[PDB]
Structure formats: C-alpha cells, structure tokens
Amino acid sequence: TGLSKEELLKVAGSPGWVRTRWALLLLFWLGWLGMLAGAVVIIVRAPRCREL
Amino acid sequence: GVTLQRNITLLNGVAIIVGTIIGSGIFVTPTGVLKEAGSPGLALVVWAACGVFSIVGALCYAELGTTISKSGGDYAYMLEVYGSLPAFLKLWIELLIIRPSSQYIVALVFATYLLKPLFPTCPVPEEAAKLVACLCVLLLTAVNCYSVKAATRVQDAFAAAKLLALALIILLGFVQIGKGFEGTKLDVGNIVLALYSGLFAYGGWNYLNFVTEEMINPYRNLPLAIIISLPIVTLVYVLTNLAYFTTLSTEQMLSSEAVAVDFGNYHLGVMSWIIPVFVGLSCFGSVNGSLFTSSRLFFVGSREGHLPSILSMIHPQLLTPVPSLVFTCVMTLLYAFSKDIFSVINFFSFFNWLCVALAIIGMIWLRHRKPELERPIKVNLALPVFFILACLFLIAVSFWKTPVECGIGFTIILSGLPVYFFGVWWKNKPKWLLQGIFSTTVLCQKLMQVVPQET
Ligand SMILES: Nc1cc(COc2c(Cl)cc(C[C@H](N)C(=O)O)cc2Cl)c2oc(-c3ccccc3)nc2c1
Ligand SMILES: CC(C)CCC[C@@H](C)[C@H]1CC[C@H]2[C@@H]3CC=C4C[C@@H](O)CC[C@]4(C)[C@H]3CC[C@]12C
Ligand SMILES: CC(C)CCC[C@@H](C)[C@H]1CC[C@H]2[C@@H]3CC=C4C[C@@H](O)CC[C@]4(C)[C@H]3CC[C@]12C
C-alpha cells in the first residue's frame, strides 16, 4: 500500500504540487496538439498518389 | 468515500460488448472464410455456425459473472478456482502482449482506414499512420480519465456508428436484389479452418465481464446485455455477408484486401469514401472499449496483490483509476516501435480460447465444489460441456495451423514464472528494493493525486 486518503490530500494541495499537476496537464495537451500538427504536416507534405 | 461507482446502464453494457465484437472484422475478414469454404453457401453457413457457438459460450459467462461479481472477468474467474499462480500467468500475457498489441493494432486500423480516402490507390504514409494511431490512444486514455460517463457516451456513439454502417451495407445489398451453393471445399480439414478463421470476427463477447462491478444492476443486466447483443451480432453478420455476395463475385472477394471498400466503390460511386471512414470510426469505438475494459483488468490484478499497488489507486474527485489507464496507454504506445506487429499476436492464437475453456471448466468444478453459492443464472450443464469439448478441439486446431508459433507463445507464457516468483513469492525482501518501491509509489500518488479504494 501507500498513503491514506486524508494523509495524501493534506499534502497534495501544496501550491508547488498543484502548479506541477496543472503544468503536466497543460504540457500533455500541448504535446498532443503538437503531435496532431505533426500528423497533419505529414499528410499534406506527402505524394498524393497516382490516379487510375 | 472512494470507489469505482456503478455507472454502466444496460444500453451502455450492450455498447461495450457490440462495440468490441463488431471490430474491424466484418469489414475485411469475409475473404478468410471464402478462402477455406470455397462456396458462398458454405461460407454463409459457417458465419451462422460460429455465431451460435459464440452465443453458447457467452451464456456461460452470463452464468459466471452472476456467480462471481468481481470486475476481473476472465482473470477473476481463474483466480476464484485455480488460485494465485494460474491467474497471474494470464494477467502477465494480457499486460505484456495481448491487450497493448490488440489496442495498438486496432488503433492503426482506425488510422489507416480513416485516412484511406485521401490515398485511394496506394499506401497511407506510414509515418502519418503511426501518429494518427497514437493520437487516438492518447485521446481515449484522456477521455477515460475524465469520466466513466464520458467514456460510455463515446462508446454509445461509436457502437451506433458501427451498426449504422452495417445497416447501410445490408440495405444496399437488398436494393441490389430489388434491381435484379457453388464449388465447395467439402473436406473437414478445410471446413475446420473456415470455422476457426471465422471465430475471430466474434472474438470480444467476453469483454463485458471485466466491468461487471460497475453495472447498475449486474445480476439482471450482465446476462441480459449478452442476450441483447450476440444474437443481434449473429443476425447482422449473416445479413452483411449476404449483402457482399449480391455484389462481389467469389473471385473478387478471394483477392480484395478490404472487402467493404469494394462494395462501397460499386454502390456509392462519388460517395464511396463514406464506407472507409465508417470502418475507421468503427475501430475508434473498439480502441475505446478495449482501453476502458483493459484498465479494469490491471486494476483488479493490483487489488488482488498480483500487480504493483499504484494501479489500484483512484482519483477522488473523478472516480477513474488514473494510474491503470496511464499504464495501459504507455504500454500501447511501446508497440508503436515494432516494424511488424500481427506476428506477436499470432503467437497467441490458442491463448484466448484456452483461457475461455479454463474458465468454463472452472464453472463445472465450481458447481461440484460449492453448490450453495448464489446463482441467478443456472444454464443446462449440456451447454458448458459442449462448449468446453469444442474449445479443446479448437485449441488443437490453433496449434495444427502453425505448430511453431503457438510454441513461441507457450515459451513466452513461461516468462511469467520469473516475474511471479520475484513479485509474489519473494515478498520483495531487500530494503533497497522495498524502500524504492514505496518512494516511487508515494511519488505517483502525489504526482496525480490518487488514493487507495475503500472496501
Ligand atoms: N488472446 C487474444 C485476445 C484478444 C481479445 O479478444 C478479441 C477481441 Cl477484443 C477482438 C477480436 C476481433 C473483433 N471481433 C473484430 O471483429 O475485429 C478478436 C478477439 Cl480474440 C485478441 O484480439 C486480437 C486482435 C484484435 C484486433 C486485431 C488483431 C488481433 N488478438 C487477440 C488475442
Ligand atoms: C485525433 C485523432 C483521433 C484523429 C486524427 C485525424 C487527422 C490527422 C485527420 C482527419 C481529417 C484530416 C484532414 C481531412 C482533409 C484534408 C484535406 C487535404 O487536402 C489535406 C489533408 C487534410 C487537411 C486532412 C489533415 C489530417 C486530418 C485532420
Ligand atoms: C514514461 C515513458 C515510458 C514515456 C511515456 C510516453 C511514450 C510511451 C509515448 C509518448 C508519445 C509517443 C510517440 C508519439 C509519436 C511517435 C512517432 C511515430 O511515427 C513513431 C512512435 C512515436 C515516436 C511515439 C512512441 C511512444 C511515445 C514516445
């Protein structure tokens, strides 16, 4: 096991950790939007293939 | 205070099973049954046949999951019979290979078919296909962190997209009849490979059992969600096959690598692109259903002590098992590196049917050992024994198809024995491991604000 419910939540509300979790959530979605921008770049910047 | 709450209503329970059965399979797998049947008649019969077999199996899980209400599904039913080690050897293979490879493969099918109408005549660019697979897996592990009501509303929407797509296919088939048996591979050694290659398209029917514990009313809704779905699937499959045979000749289906797309090209002309996109959105639903369900398997495995304790923790304000989801996403993305992928799943042809056979053998032994345990469902013992006997034959067929590859799979199962002895039998005794385990656990609890569930 690890920390109790109350034992965790009295520490996890500290401003450093609250801003850390906000930063990781922002960084994740920024990284996913960046990966979508990358995927769309590759779909545009590729050879639209030979017509029958 | 903190637990996984009972969010899944009956129609969402039907969504979790129909969404993960219908899969990619029916839009690309018909070719595999014609290859071993030769004849549209024999093909359309084995489609019905492995349908009624699948109903018979699911009726045993409709029993089991009312006798044992644990969300471990196929794993919990082993743990409650064969005990600690046999259940772990399952969970190891599910964790390491089967669930993350399955999730990745069907995400890559989502990526390729959703892009396909930009590239009709040629490959979809591979460096794009692997991103559009990863964006899907990352998105659905975000959605299934945010709310089980969001997760199940997503699968309602995509389960609907799938059945709508098959209704459109069936309708155009009847329209082609409105506009106005053959040479059969009658060898039993051909027929058995036809049947065994068709059963793949029904694979998924057990997946509801891994969320038994989150049903609003499991003792009613868990058997009803099976009987409301597998007969519906079986009908839609025989009708969808019928629809293809109105339009594609045997030679064309034996030699086309995306059967639904050819049927799309013949009927919809300028609008043909609709069917590729529906195969895509169809697979997105199957990634979601798998990620959802899969997160509960590892959760349960950690609650029963087989797996590191972080995966049991829940996020108190959202009531989703955030570390189990995060683990499942990462383990899916680690398959993105592999230059080939279907092979690693083909190594375990036998494994799915083996675990099912062991679960229902378990249900026989459980009836002898404890008749006093409560049973809202009590199926005639003929069906379990029929279904077991049939699976023990298909497990042998699975080896006989490729006696090398099922041996490689069986070799990887034994990789579970090192991990079980190190992770369970050794009691983690060295203090430089034990203190580091704890330090990493309390870090993760802090880092994503998660806490143990309350009995
Ligand atoms: N042991 C095992 C277990 C499962 C999980 O159960 C299944 C599921 Cl979840 C879906 C399908 C295919 C589905 N019925 C479809 O129509 O595409 C088959 C099985 Cl055995 C596997 O999935 C797959 C799989 C799924 C998609 C693409 C390629 C392979 N291999 C599996 C091996
Ligand atoms: C996020 C996950 C779930 C799905 C990602 C799919 C993305 C990569 C796909 C879906 C539809 C696609 C667009 C559809 C049509 C066009 C027009 C064409 O002239 C260039 C590419 C472009 C602009 C595509 C870019 C990539 C695109 C946005
Ligand atoms: C905590 C550690 C294990 C990292 C967790 C995130 C990992 C599994 C994920 C996050 C984003 C992912 C990458 C996203 C995009 C691509 C480009 C693709 O063409 C090849 C794979 C690759 C390079 C992925 C590999 C796996 C990846 C690096």
| Rg for chain A, CA atoms, rounded | 21
The one-letter code for the residue type at B409 is: G
Residue B310 tokens read as 């972080």
Residue B160 tokens read as 């609907």
Chain A environment of B454 (Cβ under 8 Å): 5
| Inter-chain residue contact A21 with B132, CB threshold 8 Å | no
Task: Give the C-alpha separation, B278 to B26, whole Å.
Answer: 12
Q: Provide the 10 A C-beta neighbour count for residue B252.
A: 16
Task: Give the residue carrying structure tokens 């549209």.
Answer: B40
Q: Is the distance from the beta carbon of residue A33 to the nearest atom of ligand 2 less than 6 Å?
A: no
- Given A5, A35, A46, which is nearest B131 (Cβ)? A35
Q: How many CA atoms lie within 13 A of B425 on its CB side?
A: 10
> Is the CB of residue B158 less than 8 Å from the CB of residue B144?
no
Q: How close does chain A come to B338, measured CA to CA in Å?
A: 19
The count of residues in chain A is 52
Q: Where chain B is broken, by preceding residue (C–N > 2.5 Å)?
A: 180
The one-letter code for the residue type at A17 is: W
- Given B119, B135, B313, which is nearest A35 (Cβ)? B135
> Is the CB of residue B96 less than 8 Å from the CB of residue B414?
no
Chain B environment of A43 (Cβ under 8 Å): 115, 118, 125, 128
Task: Give the C-alpha separation, B138 to B344, whole Å.
Answer: 22
End-to-end CA distance of chain A: 63
**Longest CA–CA separation in chain A, Å:** 67
| Inter-chain residue contact A49 with B121, CB threshold 8 Å | yes
| Inter-chain residue contact A21 with B447, CB threshold 8 Å | yes
Task: Give the C-alpha separation, B337 to B183, whole Å.
Answer: 44
Q: Provide the 10 A C-beta neighbour count for residue B264.
A: 25
Nearest-atom index, ligand 3, CA of A31: 11
Chain B environment of A39 (Cβ under 8 Å): 128, 131-132, 135
The one-letter code for the residue type at B61 is: Y
Task: Give the C-alpha separation, B335 to B238, whole Å.
Answer: 34
Phi-psi label, residue B335: left if phi above 0, alpha if psi -120 to 50, beta otherwise: alpha
CA-nearest of B247, B306, B223 to B14 is B223
In b/e form, how buried is each residue of B132-156, taking b as 16+ CB within 10 angstroms? bbbbbbbbbbbbbbeebeebbebbb
Task: Give the C-alpha separation, B153 to B8, whole Å.
Answer: 10
Q: How close does chain B come to A27, measured CA to CA in Å?
A: 13
What is the A40 CA–ligand 2 centroid distance (Å)?
A: 6
- Which residues, including other chains, have CB under 8 Å from residue B366's CB and lie 6 or more apart? B67, B80, B81, B373
Residue B201 tokens read as 């398209």
Q: Which of B269-272's residues contact partners 24+ apart within 8 Å by CB, and which partners?
A: B272/B117
The one-letter code for the residue type at B20 is: T
> Closest-lying ligand to the alpha carbon of A39?
2
Resolution in A: 3.9
Residue of B nearest to A51 (CA): B121
* Residue B346 buriedness (CB in 10 A; 0-12 / 13-18 / 19+): middle
Nearest-atom index, ligand 3, CA of B330: 8
CA triplet B252, B253, B255: central angle to 5 degrees? 70
CA-nearest of B140, B332, B119, B250 to A42 is B119
> Is the CB of residue B61 less than 8 Å from the CB of residue B387?
no
DSSP letter for each residue of B312-346: G-B-TTT---HHHHHHHHHHHHTTTT-S--HHHHH
Is the Cβ of A52 closer than 8 Å to some Cβ of chain B?
yes
